[PDB]
Amino acid sequence: DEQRRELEEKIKLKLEELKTKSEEERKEIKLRVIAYVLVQLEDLQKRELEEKIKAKLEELKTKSEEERKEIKLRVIAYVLVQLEDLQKNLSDEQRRELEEKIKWKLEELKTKSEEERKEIKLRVIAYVLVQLEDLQKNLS
Ligand code: NA
Ligand code: NA
């Protein structure tokens, strides 16, 4: 699967670059990823999708804390690859429109409690996982 291997190589490089960043930078990058996925979930924010997400959330809660941390890092690396690929397809003005939407979701995030923010991040991770498994079935 040339597509699957190329994607896994892109995720690997982003993981390696993410690990070399400071604790402070890692946090900012993680929050940007949450905010971007939130921008992408706006469309349906009020099927099947929420049933698929909820299944995945329930699956994630049976895992160890250490496995959920590794999953979280992979998700972040994957969204960084998708965000980079998305930006290549935008004009300068579309890129600035997207940054405005991301920043607005980031400010929205800051107003939440730690407990609500933890729930939002887990849901963002579940959605990303469902998308990627729904995606991996069309790569070769
Ligand atoms: Na550090
Ligand atoms: Na998965």
Author numbering: 4 to 49, 57 to 150
Tell me what the authors wrote about this structure, in their words.
While kcTRP3c.1 and 3c.2 remained recalcitrant to crystallization, crystals of kcTRP3d.1, 3d.2, and 3d.3 grew readily, and their structures were solved via molecular replacement. kcTRP3d.1 and 3d.3 were phased with the original designed atomic coordinates of kcTRP3d as a molecular probe. The crystal structures of kcTRP3d.1–3 validated the accuracies of the designed molecular models and their intended deeply knotted topologies. Superposition of the structures to the original designed atomic coordinates of kcTRP3d produced all-atom rmsd values of 1.84 Å (kcTRP3d.1), 1.43 Å (kcTRP3d.2), and 1.90 Å (kcTRP3d.3). The structure of kcTRP3d.3 displays 120° rotational averaging in the crystal lattice, such that the positions between the repeating subunits contain a mixture of both peptide loops and protein termini. However, the conformations of secondary structure are unambiguous in electron density. The thermodynamic stabilities of kcTRP3d.1, kcTRP3d.2, and kcTRP3d.3 were studied under equilibrium conditions using the chemical denaturant guanidinium chloride (GdmCl) and unfolding was monitored using both the intrinsic fluorescence and far-UV CD signal of the protein to probe both tertiary and secondary structure. All three constructs show similar stabilities and the stability of kcTRP3d.3 did not change significantly between 25 and 10 °C. Collectively, these data establish that all three constructs unfold and populate an intermediate state, in which a considerable amount, if not all, of the α-helical structure has been lost but in which there remains some burial of the tryptophan side chain(s) suggesting that hydrophobic interactions play a role in stabilizing the intermediate state. As with many knotted proteins, apart from MJ0366 which is both small and has a very shallow knot, the refolding kinetics of kcTRP3d.3 are complex. In contrast to UCH-L1, for kcTRP3d.3 we also have evidence from the interrupted unfolding experiments that the denatured state initially populated on unfolding (which we term D*), undergoes a conformational change over time (with a half-life of ~200–350 ms), which we hypothesize is associated with untying of the knot to the denatured state observed in equilibrium conditions (D).
